[PDB]
Design a protein around this ligand. Structure first.
Ligand SMILES: [Mg+2]
Ligand SMILES: [Mg+2]
Ligand SMILES: [Mg+2]
Ligand SMILES: [Mg+2]
Ligand SMILES: [Mg+2]
Ligand SMILES: [Mg+2]
Ligand SMILES: [Mg+2]
Ligand SMILES: [Mg+2]
Ligand SMILES: [Mg+2]
Ligand SMILES: [Mg+2]
Ligand SMILES: [Mg+2]
Ligand SMILES: [Mg+2]
Ligand SMILES: [Mg+2]
Ligand SMILES: [Mg+2]
Ligand SMILES: [Mg+2]
Ligand SMILES: [Mg+2]
Ligand SMILES: [Mg+2]
Ligand SMILES: [Mg+2]
Ligand SMILES: [Mg+2]
Ligand SMILES: [Mg+2]
Ligand SMILES: [Mg+2]
Ligand SMILES: [Mg+2]
Ligand SMILES: [Mg+2]
Ligand SMILES: [Mg+2]
Ligand SMILES: [Mg+2]
Ligand SMILES: [Mg+2]
Ligand SMILES: [Mg+2]
Ligand SMILES: [Mg+2]
Ligand SMILES: [Mg+2]
Ligand SMILES: [Mg+2]
Ligand SMILES: [Mg+2]
Ligand SMILES: [Mg+2]
Ligand SMILES: [Mg+2]
Ligand SMILES: [Mg+2]
Ligand SMILES: [Mg+2]
Ligand SMILES: [Mg+2]
Ligand SMILES: [Mg+2]
Ligand SMILES: [Mg+2]
Ligand SMILES: [Mg+2]
Ligand SMILES: [Mg+2]
Ligand SMILES: [Mg+2]
Ligand SMILES: [Mg+2]
Ligand SMILES: [Mg+2]
Ligand SMILES: [Mg+2]
Ligand SMILES: [Mg+2]
Ligand SMILES: [Mg+2]
Ligand SMILES: [Mg+2]
Ligand SMILES: [Mg+2]
Ligand SMILES: [Mg+2]
Ligand SMILES: [Mg+2]
Ligand SMILES: [Mg+2]
Ligand SMILES: [Mg+2]
Ligand SMILES: [Mg+2]
Ligand SMILES: [Mg+2]
Ligand SMILES: [Mg+2]
Ligand SMILES: [Mg+2]
Ligand SMILES: [Mg+2]
Ligand SMILES: [Mg+2]
Ligand SMILES: [Mg+2]
Ligand SMILES: [Mg+2]
Ligand SMILES: [Mg+2]
Ligand SMILES: [Mg+2]
Ligand SMILES: [Mg+2]
Ligand SMILES: [Mg+2]
Ligand SMILES: [Mg+2]
Ligand SMILES: [Mg+2]
Ligand SMILES: [Mg+2]
Ligand SMILES: [Mg+2]
Ligand SMILES: [Mg+2]
Ligand SMILES: [Mg+2]
Ligand SMILES: [Mg+2]
Ligand SMILES: [Mg+2]
Ligand SMILES: [Mg+2]
Ligand SMILES: [Mg+2]
Ligand SMILES: [Mg+2]
Ligand SMILES: [Mg+2]
Ligand SMILES: [Mg+2]
Ligand SMILES: [Mg+2]
Ligand SMILES: [Mg+2]
Ligand SMILES: [Mg+2]
Ligand SMILES: [Mg+2]
Ligand SMILES: [Mg+2]
Ligand SMILES: [Mg+2]
Ligand SMILES: [Mg+2]
Ligand SMILES: [Mg+2]
Ligand SMILES: [Mg+2]
Ligand SMILES: [Mg+2]
Ligand SMILES: [Mg+2]
Ligand SMILES: [Mg+2]
Ligand SMILES: [Mg+2]
Ligand SMILES: [Mg+2]
Ligand SMILES: [Mg+2]
Ligand SMILES: [Mg+2]
Ligand SMILES: [Mg+2]
Ligand SMILES: [Mg+2]
Ligand SMILES: [Mg+2]
Ligand SMILES: [Mg+2]
Ligand SMILES: [Mg+2]
Ligand SMILES: [Mg+2]
Ligand SMILES: [Mg+2]
Ligand SMILES: [Mg+2]
Ligand SMILES: [Mg+2]
Ligand SMILES: [Mg+2]
Ligand SMILES: [Mg+2]
Ligand SMILES: [Mg+2]
Ligand SMILES: [Mg+2]
Ligand SMILES: [Mg+2]
Ligand SMILES: [Mg+2]
Ligand SMILES: [Mg+2]
Ligand SMILES: [Mg+2]
Ligand SMILES: [Mg+2]
Ligand SMILES: [Mg+2]
Ligand SMILES: [Mg+2]
Ligand SMILES: [Mg+2]
Ligand SMILES: [Mg+2]
Ligand SMILES: [Mg+2]
Ligand SMILES: [Mg+2]
Ligand SMILES: [Mg+2]
Ligand SMILES: [Mg+2]
Ligand SMILES: [Mg+2]
Ligand SMILES: [Mg+2]
Ligand SMILES: [Mg+2]
Ligand SMILES: [Mg+2]
Ligand SMILES: [Mg+2]
Ligand SMILES: [Mg+2]
Ligand SMILES: [Mg+2]
Ligand SMILES: [Mg+2]
Ligand SMILES: [Mg+2]
Ligand SMILES: [Mg+2]
Ligand SMILES: [Mg+2]
Ligand SMILES: [Mg+2]
Ligand SMILES: [Mg+2]
Ligand SMILES: [Mg+2]
Ligand SMILES: [Mg+2]
Ligand SMILES: [Mg+2]
Ligand SMILES: [Mg+2]
Ligand SMILES: [Mg+2]
Ligand SMILES: [Mg+2]
Ligand SMILES: [Mg+2]
Ligand SMILES: [Mg+2]
Ligand SMILES: [Mg+2]
Ligand SMILES: [Mg+2]
Ligand SMILES: [Mg+2]
Ligand SMILES: [Mg+2]
Ligand SMILES: [Mg+2]
Ligand SMILES: [Mg+2]
Ligand SMILES: [Mg+2]
Ligand SMILES: [Mg+2]
Ligand SMILES: [Mg+2]
Ligand SMILES: [Mg+2]
Ligand SMILES: [Mg+2]
Ligand SMILES: [Mg+2]
Ligand SMILES: [Mg+2]
Ligand SMILES: [Mg+2]
Ligand SMILES: [Mg+2]
Ligand SMILES: [Mg+2]
Ligand SMILES: [Mg+2]
Ligand SMILES: [Mg+2]
Ligand SMILES: [Mg+2]
Ligand SMILES: [Mg+2]
Ligand SMILES: [Mg+2]
Ligand SMILES: [Mg+2]
Ligand SMILES: [Mg+2]
Ligand SMILES: [Mg+2]
Ligand SMILES: [Mg+2]
Ligand SMILES: [Mg+2]
Ligand SMILES: [Mg+2]
Ligand SMILES: [Mg+2]
Ligand SMILES: [Mg+2]
Ligand SMILES: [Mg+2]
Ligand SMILES: [Mg+2]
Ligand SMILES: [Mg+2]
Ligand SMILES: [Mg+2]
Ligand SMILES: [Mg+2]
Ligand SMILES: [Mg+2]
Ligand SMILES: [Mg+2]
Ligand SMILES: [Mg+2]
Ligand SMILES: [Mg+2]
Ligand SMILES: [Mg+2]
Ligand SMILES: [Mg+2]
Ligand SMILES: [Mg+2]
Ligand SMILES: [Mg+2]
Ligand SMILES: [Mg+2]
Ligand SMILES: [Mg+2]
Ligand SMILES: [Mg+2]
Ligand SMILES: [Mg+2]
Ligand SMILES: [Mg+2]
Ligand SMILES: [Mg+2]
Ligand SMILES: [Mg+2]
Ligand SMILES: [Mg+2]
Ligand SMILES: [Mg+2]
Ligand SMILES: [Mg+2]
Ligand SMILES: [Mg+2]
Ligand SMILES: [Mg+2]
Ligand SMILES: [Mg+2]
Ligand SMILES: [Mg+2]
Ligand SMILES: [Mg+2]
Ligand SMILES: [Mg+2]
Ligand SMILES: [Mg+2]
Ligand SMILES: [Mg+2]
Ligand SMILES: [Mg+2]
Ligand SMILES: [Mg+2]
Ligand SMILES: [Mg+2]
Ligand SMILES: [Mg+2]
Ligand SMILES: [Mg+2]
Ligand SMILES: [Mg+2]
Ligand SMILES: [Mg+2]
Ligand SMILES: [Mg+2]
Ligand SMILES: [Mg+2]
Ligand SMILES: [Mg+2]
Ligand SMILES: [Mg+2]
Ligand SMILES: [Mg+2]
Ligand SMILES: [Mg+2]
Ligand SMILES: [Mg+2]
Ligand SMILES: [Mg+2]
Ligand SMILES: [Mg+2]
Ligand SMILES: [Mg+2]
Ligand SMILES: [Mg+2]
Ligand SMILES: [Mg+2]
Ligand SMILES: [Mg+2]
Ligand SMILES: [Mg+2]
Ligand SMILES: [Mg+2]
Ligand SMILES: [Mg+2]
Ligand SMILES: [Mg+2]
Ligand SMILES: [Mg+2]
Ligand SMILES: [Mg+2]
Ligand SMILES: [Mg+2]
Ligand SMILES: [Mg+2]
Ligand SMILES: [Mg+2]
Ligand SMILES: [Mg+2]
Ligand SMILES: [Mg+2]
Ligand SMILES: [Mg+2]
Lengths: 48, 275
RNA sequence: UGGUUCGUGGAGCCAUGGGGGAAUCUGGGCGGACCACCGCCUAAGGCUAAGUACUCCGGGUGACCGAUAGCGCACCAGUAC
RNA sequence: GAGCUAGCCCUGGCCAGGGUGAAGCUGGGGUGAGACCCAGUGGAGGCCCGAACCGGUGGGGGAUGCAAACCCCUCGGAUGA
RNA sequence: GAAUGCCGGCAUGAGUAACGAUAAAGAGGGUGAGAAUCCCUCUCGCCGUAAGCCCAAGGGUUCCUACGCAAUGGUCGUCAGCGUAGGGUUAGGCGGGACCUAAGGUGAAGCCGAAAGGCGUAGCCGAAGGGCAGCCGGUUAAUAUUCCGGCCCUUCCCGCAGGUGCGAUGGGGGGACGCUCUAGGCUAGGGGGACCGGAGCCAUGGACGAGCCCGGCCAGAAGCGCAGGGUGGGAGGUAGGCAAAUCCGCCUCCCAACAAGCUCUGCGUGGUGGGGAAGCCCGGGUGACAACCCCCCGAAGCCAGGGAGCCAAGAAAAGCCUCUAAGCACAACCUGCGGGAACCCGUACCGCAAACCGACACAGGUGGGCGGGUGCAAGAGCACUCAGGCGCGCGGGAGAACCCUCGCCAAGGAACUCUGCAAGUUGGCCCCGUAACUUCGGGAGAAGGGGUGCUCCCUGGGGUGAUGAGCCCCGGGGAGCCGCAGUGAACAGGCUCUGGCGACUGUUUACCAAAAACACAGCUCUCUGCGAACUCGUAAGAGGAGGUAUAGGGAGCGACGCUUGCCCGGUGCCGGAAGGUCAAGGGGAGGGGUGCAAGCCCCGAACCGAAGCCCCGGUGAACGGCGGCCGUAACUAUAACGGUCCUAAGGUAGCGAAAUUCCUUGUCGGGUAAGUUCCGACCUGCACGAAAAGCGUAACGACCGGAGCGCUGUCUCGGCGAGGG
RNA sequence: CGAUGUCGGCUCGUCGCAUCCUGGGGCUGAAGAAGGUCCCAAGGGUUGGGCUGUUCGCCCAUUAAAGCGGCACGCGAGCUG
RNA sequence: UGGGAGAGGGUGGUGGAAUUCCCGGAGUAGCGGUGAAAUGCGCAGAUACCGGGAGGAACGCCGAUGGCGAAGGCAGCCACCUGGUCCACCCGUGACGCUGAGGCGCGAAAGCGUGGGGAGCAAACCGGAUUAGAUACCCGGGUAGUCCACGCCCUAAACG
RNA sequence: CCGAGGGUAGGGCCCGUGACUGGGGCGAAGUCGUAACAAGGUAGCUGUACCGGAAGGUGCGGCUGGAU
RNA sequence: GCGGGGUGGAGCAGCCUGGUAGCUCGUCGGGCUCAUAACCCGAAGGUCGUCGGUUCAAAUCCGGCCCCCGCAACCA
């Protein structure tokens, strides 16, 4: 039956994207934390 | 009239529809329509702020003229009477000699082909608009402004009408369709006659679906919910109210008056509605 | 109403949201309700090193660890997953 | 976090075939005029049967499954909320 | 040494379950160290409204080839979506962008918020909507509407020529719209041909035949033809379309009007270019100078923005045409022609799936288009079959119990069991024929029954033709033939009687409950005069609603019919300018601290002083409530009647052992041989009762009872057989 | 209580004997036939139905008889529900 | 042909008296009701009085022992639309007549459906009295209904 | 072929009977009240509507077959 | 189990606060009437369910016992 992951790139980018993160005070902090931790990818990679 | 159906389905047995006899034009004046932004009952927060709304037929909003003192002294011909889905009343297409076309709410008796006009000099005849002060006391009237140059606010629904009861100073005394006695300003415009389509109230929707067409989603009783959802919620088996009957938000709903007491417009209401 | 050790207490002091509302050294604040006396101080403008805190970074040193320990990672780890 | 799920908004798409035959309209009868009746035409409907499609009634199987909700038979809706 | 401790290693169960749909395999040849599993051939089976084909998501090199088999593959492996390497995606016309807007998002102006931030007309962004110019074939191991070939087209720049008051983010027109049903004419696609072309074949008893088998098209500018769409022309006035306007709108007149004309599209033809089978022979060669024709069926697609009807009344903006303003009229724009110019991204491959979502090469899920033939009334149903694709990545045996899925059964026929659970029966179509009741629609496919194939003859009507031939469609009437059996296989209701509950179609606990629950039309109460009530938010702002009492919110009830009694003491709500209580504040009789003093400071009685509460009244489709004891009638029994106490008033109609009845399997009647169930009654109703509605009600229900007929392995009562284990 | 699954049915039994039947006896208010009552005896037997979830019980039709109890009110890694 | 009388019928307007409610003034100790009382209303200002407003219903005098209509029935006033009828003239038609099973229409009051309206009155209902009881008669309240529209019902001491 | 009739199925009319139930008639020596006849103690009767242990009451309109 | 009652013939007060048994009805006597109902005037009848106890004295306070009313009897 229909499971929970139904990929959609526009949705993916418009949600967890870089610009989305930068727009909100909460999201900017995500990027701060991820950088501080040293994540290789601050934001979900998506092929546009 | 209202049109009955034969009972060839369980619903058509009781369903009744408007007769549409007064309609002469089944197409809206293109330059007078704009898209109607449906809401679903949700505000600018996306939050439902009026429950049980949505899924109705798509509508095109007709631009109606509720000022009419806008074009004093310039007569107009009644070109057509049309269906308007955004109101209970019918609407009239006015072709001004001016060359301008505008919609008004169609009064009862208004004939296609006849001529009407707004202004202090207007003949007291169906479809004319005048300040209240220049209208004979006792004549019935609709589409009444509440304050000068602010637009027709009163008596707009199908079959409704206000009536002038007398004069007092700058103000005149109207008996609103609810029976409330109120002082309205003399300079407030109004259109003589009663609103048409008075048969509107005798329509029997006939089935669940018809309310859905009208954008009215199912309404759920408090008694059929749970204690989280509603004051009337819960109880093993069926249950009475067990408290004074209330809205989902807690306030009492049988009898409890709600008009703000210290309201400035209190000075102008003479007799709150009957019955 | 907050702040002070002060939780309405005899509750001053410092601060101020509302109302009222002065004076210029014979002016004003303070010394724990208030008054007198005796003293202290100069509100409603601003700046000011050093002594003080911290450790991403560099170095020195361990009755500190020695690959299940010591940082999550001695190794291509905030990786694989 | 509404890429699952619920509701709503915008914009598109889908519903084999068969069946029943509302109003209306036309003609005839009827009457003072009518109501009305009859035939034809007509093609209405949260109407009927039944695929797609949406479901999930009963039973059997499955139960370290093919599957963390599946399979077979049967069954509900299918121009409409 | 224990914490169902933590991390790791290794055991046990055990050579055990399992190896993922029961569509299915068999042989020969080849390769190789090794072959049921890789390649080739033949035979066999499965899919075919797909298990075939083409898009879009999503995946991201999985595509093609060479060389490999450690691991991955549920076995094997020489094979592979696996390892290594090399190659492969070509666009002015396809899709997106350099175009437009939709919800929404963002946001000059402006508004709000301790901070972060929240709003917000314009504008901007935002598409699977609008707009917009490429069709057929060929070619590669692998790309093609992209390269090539043929034939067409679009914009931009510039120049020439003819033309005109040219010029816009501004005005106007247009774009521009629903659901259902539908006309004419076409096309896609299909069937047949005694006609045309074709390698061939004559078997096994017959046929050298009007024999069999195969194929008889595709694209195409202008012109034209057929069919549709769109559209009146002229003049005068003009105060409206936030400037202007010759445009548009409005008024008057003249000519035209189911004509045309003008214009746009579809289809046909069309210079020209393409393709072109069976079979044979090693993807190709040949067939072949291939033929390329007539008839019929015919769309849900096209002409289209067509037509009719209906109510629930059915986007926007740009491109486009027209108008004029600044401006400028050496400009500028339009029309025709010519040359030049024409950018960025995608394009491989899988795509109902072994490449996507499900940890798996997972019997699950995934949107759009194509989807052939015959027969069965129709069809996208069902059976077989074309093209194409497959036989599902363990096999070989054996023929126990037992299991699953299936077939049949003597006599009986529900005796099974909580229950006919399950499996039988019934089954499509035509005709005949159908009851109570009913809201007159229905109930109804009620029930029940007859027919059903093939053959010859006679005949009726329609379509296409022509009015005829042929072809296709719908029939009717005779006489016959065979079988146990003619919807001969497959797909396809068992029926009736009678209660409860819910009017009804619908909705619901994704994953133990689909129902009597929710919703539902409809009835009633109540709130709301509009900056409405109400809801969300601290606010701004929103929704309500661009609505206005025939409207909007809350609540209860739940189609419809006949009805809905009595109680306002208590609670609530509504009304009540009196009176009572009443906080801050006002007022300051009087009292106190202090000082030599003026003075400063504290307390403080009377009286004034809101809402709310008290108090008076109303109110039930407001919250709710709706009695006790004792006696009495020509025999008993019961009690119409009476006495008395209490209450705010003591349950009216109707219903009643009930979805409610404890005693209870109440009593009586029906049905049965036998009835704790069921139905009809009775009424001492433990403990029904009138919008948490009372009593009924046709139709409806995968709801829950009872009964009968039909028929059956449910059973007496088991047996045999099949296939997967 | 870091789980001993709980009524009834089905299936399969096995034991006890305080014996329902059949076998053997004594007494009888035992004429006979048939009963009553007690003693011995566990070898075998102990039916089909209607009602209800029922065990139980009532009822139908028969019968030699239609026995009562134990086995976690025997039996759910055996089924039902 | 010419003339008359009449609450005959239908639609639309419209006039005053009165009852009720509401607003203002003024005013105070009761008012109301009955056989007599009480319930009720009133110092929270009633009754009685003056002014204003609102709304519904019925039309006093004329009015009659009258008129009109087939019956039911019809009454302020105006206008329109319309039926029946009588008289005079003795002009026209030439028996075209009478009755009438069915049929069709009309049909007071109450009653029903849908929607208005609602002053007075008033079934039901509540209270106060009377009474042995009083589910009545009398009194204080009071909802349907009485009024309008459209559609039903079709009864009667629909009687002379 | 038709055909007595037999069989299956569904209808129609009639008769008998049925727990229980509705009123009706008679019986009469019971019970409760007194509705009608006089102005019957509220004139009666009436169609209709609602109500009440029961006669009945009341509303609305009608009749005199009403005393004074 | 918890609460509440038993008083002239019927139905209710009196009990809490000890002394002091009351109201309506019925009953008997007498009026009015032909008689009857109604009505009027008079009168009778309860040792307080019992047995015990506290007190000077108990319908009254307390305890035992009988009887009647109401509520409860759940998870199981
Ligand atoms: Mg999706
Ligand atoms: Mg993905
Ligand atoms: Mg996307
Ligand atoms: Mg997308
Ligand atoms: Mg983003
Ligand atoms: Mg990096
Ligand atoms: Mg990572
Ligand atoms: Mg991130
Ligand atoms: Mg109308
Ligand atoms: Mg109808
Ligand atoms: Mg109809
Ligand atoms: Mg009709
Ligand atoms: Mg129907
Ligand atoms: Mg129905
Ligand atoms: Mg309408
Ligand atoms: Mg409508
Ligand atoms: Mg209509
Ligand atoms: Mg209309
Ligand atoms: Mg439209
Ligand atoms: Mg527009
Ligand atoms: Mg709008
Ligand atoms: Mg809007
Ligand atoms: Mg928004
Ligand atoms: Mg938000
Ligand atoms: Mg938001
Ligand atoms: Mg709301
Ligand atoms: Mg809503
Ligand atoms: Mg309208
Ligand atoms: Mg309505
Ligand atoms: Mg209504
Ligand atoms: Mg709508
Ligand atoms: Mg509603
Ligand atoms: Mg509801
Ligand atoms: Mg619930
Ligand atoms: Mg919640
Ligand atoms: Mg809570
Ligand atoms: Mg709550
Ligand atoms: Mg509740
Ligand atoms: Mg509940
Ligand atoms: Mg409850
Ligand atoms: Mg509940
Ligand atoms: Mg419960
Ligand atoms: Mg309950
Ligand atoms: Mg409930
Ligand atoms: Mg319910
Ligand atoms: Mg409750
Ligand atoms: Mg309550
Ligand atoms: Mg105002
Ligand atoms: Mg202290
Ligand atoms: Mg302090
Ligand atoms: Mg301050
Ligand atoms: Mg000083
Ligand atoms: Mg000083
Ligand atoms: Mg200070
Ligand atoms: Mg100090
Ligand atoms: Mg100091
Ligand atoms: Mg220094
Ligand atoms: Mg410093
Ligand atoms: Mg060490
Ligand atoms: Mg290590
Ligand atoms: Mg480590
Ligand atoms: Mg480190
Ligand atoms: Mg490590
Ligand atoms: Mg969603
Ligand atoms: Mg969803
Ligand atoms: Mg027809
Ligand atoms: Mg028509
Ligand atoms: Mg149809
Ligand atoms: Mg249907
Ligand atoms: Mg169906
Ligand atoms: Mg199922
Ligand atoms: Mg089954
Ligand atoms: Mg089975
Ligand atoms: Mg199972
Ligand atoms: Mg399945
Ligand atoms: Mg299935
Ligand atoms: Mg459908
Ligand atoms: Mg269909
Ligand atoms: Mg539709
Ligand atoms: Mg439907
Ligand atoms: Mg130890
Ligand atoms: Mg463990
Ligand atoms: Mg363990
Ligand atoms: Mg084993
Ligand atoms: Mg398997
Ligand atoms: Mg199978
Ligand atoms: Mg092999
Ligand atoms: Mg091998
Ligand atoms: Mg096929
Ligand atoms: Mg992947
Ligand atoms: Mg490729
Ligand atoms: Mg390998
Ligand atoms: Mg290998
Ligand atoms: Mg190997
Ligand atoms: Mg492997
Ligand atoms: Mg392997
Ligand atoms: Mg595997
Ligand atoms: Mg290569
Ligand atoms: Mg090209
Ligand atoms: Mg550019
Ligand atoms: Mg844009
Ligand atoms: Mg686009
Ligand atoms: Mg394009
Ligand atoms: Mg483009
Ligand atoms: Mg082309
Ligand atoms: Mg030129
Ligand atoms: Mg030009
Ligand atoms: Mg439009
Ligand atoms: Mg569109
Ligand atoms: Mg064909
Ligand atoms: Mg072709
Ligand atoms: Mg043509
Ligand atoms: Mg002009
Ligand atoms: Mg050649
Ligand atoms: Mg040739
Ligand atoms: Mg179609
Ligand atoms: Mg059209
Ligand atoms: Mg827009
Ligand atoms: Mg560029
Ligand atoms: Mg490509
Ligand atoms: Mg699939
Ligand atoms: Mg999984
Ligand atoms: Mg596989
Ligand atoms: Mg078939
Ligand atoms: Mg078929
Ligand atoms: Mg099928
Ligand atoms: Mg296979
Ligand atoms: Mg396999
Ligand atoms: Mg058998
Ligand atoms: Mg049978
Ligand atoms: Mg049988
Ligand atoms: Mg059953
Ligand atoms: Mg069949
Ligand atoms: Mg029947
Ligand atoms: Mg019928
Ligand atoms: Mg049949
Ligand atoms: Mg044959
Ligand atoms: Mg089959
Ligand atoms: Mg069927
Ligand atoms: Mg049936
Ligand atoms: Mg029952
Ligand atoms: Mg029912
Ligand atoms: Mg239902
Ligand atoms: Mg339900
Ligand atoms: Mg319903
Ligand atoms: Mg329903
Ligand atoms: Mg449906
Ligand atoms: Mg569920
Ligand atoms: Mg659940
Ligand atoms: Mg869940
Ligand atoms: Mg779950
Ligand atoms: Mg769950
Ligand atoms: Mg379920
Ligand atoms: Mg269901
Ligand atoms: Mg419901
Ligand atoms: Mg109703
Ligand atoms: Mg809020
Ligand atoms: Mg706002
Ligand atoms: Mg708004
Ligand atoms: Mg709005
Ligand atoms: Mg509104
Ligand atoms: Mg409901
Ligand atoms: Mg009250
Ligand atoms: Mg009450
Ligand atoms: Mg309460
Ligand atoms: Mg006073
Ligand atoms: Mg006061
Ligand atoms: Mg003083
Ligand atoms: Mg109460
Ligand atoms: Mg209640
Ligand atoms: Mg009272
Ligand atoms: Mg009552
Ligand atoms: Mg009973
Ligand atoms: Mg019973
Ligand atoms: Mg019942
Ligand atoms: Mg129940
Ligand atoms: Mg009960
Ligand atoms: Mg009980
Ligand atoms: Mg019982
Ligand atoms: Mg019971
Ligand atoms: Mg018994
Ligand atoms: Mg019995
Ligand atoms: Mg009884
Ligand atoms: Mg309720
Ligand atoms: Mg109720
Ligand atoms: Mg019922
Ligand atoms: Mg009925
Ligand atoms: Mg159901
Ligand atoms: Mg068997
Ligand atoms: Mg077999
Ligand atoms: Mg076998
Ligand atoms: Mg086998
Ligand atoms: Mg335990
Ligand atoms: Mg354990
Ligand atoms: Mg013997
Ligand atoms: Mg003997
Ligand atoms: Mg034995
Ligand atoms: Mg033994
Ligand atoms: Mg029993
Ligand atoms: Mg015997
Ligand atoms: Mg047991
Ligand atoms: Mg046992
Ligand atoms: Mg079990
Ligand atoms: Mg068991
Ligand atoms: Mg066991
Ligand atoms: Mg057991
Ligand atoms: Mg159960
Ligand atoms: Mg008179
Ligand atoms: Mg003569
Ligand atoms: Mg009448
Ligand atoms: Mg009525
Ligand atoms: Mg009234
Ligand atoms: Mg009495
Ligand atoms: Mg009533
Ligand atoms: Mg009524
Ligand atoms: Mg009369
Ligand atoms: Mg008379
Ligand atoms: Mg007469
Ligand atoms: Mg015979
Ligand atoms: Mg009388
Ligand atoms: Mg009398
Ligand atoms: Mg009398
Ligand atoms: Mg009585
Ligand atoms: Mg009465
Ligand atoms: Mg007389
Ligand atoms: Mg006790
Ligand atoms: Mg006492
Ligand atoms: Mg005393
Ligand atoms: Mg003593
Ligand atoms: Mg004593
Ligand atoms: Mg004493
Ligand atoms: Mg509990």
């Amino acid at each position: 039956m229909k499971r929970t992951w139904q990929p959609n790139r526009r949705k993916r980018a418009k949600t967890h994207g870089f610009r989305a993160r930068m727009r909100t005070p909460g999201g900017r902090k995500v990027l701060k934390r991820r950088r501080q931790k040293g994540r290789w990818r601050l934001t979900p990679a998506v092929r546009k | 009239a209202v049109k009955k159906f034969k009972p060839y389905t369980p619903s058509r047995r009781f369903m009744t529809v408007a007769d549409f006899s007064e309609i002469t034009k089944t197409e809206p004046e293109k330059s007078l329509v704009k898209p109607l932004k449906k809401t679903g009952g949700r505000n600018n927060q996306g939050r439902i702020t009026v429950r049980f709304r949505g899924g109705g037929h798509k509508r095109l909003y007709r631009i109606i003229d509720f000022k009419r003192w806008d074009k004093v002294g310039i007569p107009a011909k009644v070109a057509a009477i049309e269906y308007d889905p955004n109101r209970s009343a019918r609407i009239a297409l006015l072709h001004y000699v001016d060359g301008e076309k505008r919609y008004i709410i169609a009064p009862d008796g208004l004939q296609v082909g006849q001529q009407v006009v707004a202004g202090p000099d207007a003949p007291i005849q169906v479809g004319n608009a005048l300040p209240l002060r220049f209208i004979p006391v006792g004549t019935v009237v609709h589409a009444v402004e509440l304050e000068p140059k602010k637009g027709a606010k009163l008596a707009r629904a199908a079959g409704t009408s206000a009536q002038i009861q007398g004069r007092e100073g700058d103000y005149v005394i109207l008996r609103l369709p609810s029976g409330e006695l109120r002082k309205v300003h003399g300079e407030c415009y109004a259109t003589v006659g009663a609103v048409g389509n008075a048969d509107h109230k005798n329509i029997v929707l006939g089935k669940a679906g018809r309310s859905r067409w009208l954008g009215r989603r199912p309404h759920v009783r408090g008694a059929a919910m749970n204690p989280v959802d509603h004051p009337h919620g819960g109880g093993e088996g069926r249950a009475p109210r067990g408290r004074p009957p209330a809205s989902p938000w807690g306030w009492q709903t049988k009898g409890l008056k709600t008009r703000k007491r210290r309201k400035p417009s209190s000075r102008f209401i003479i007799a709150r509605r009957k019955k």
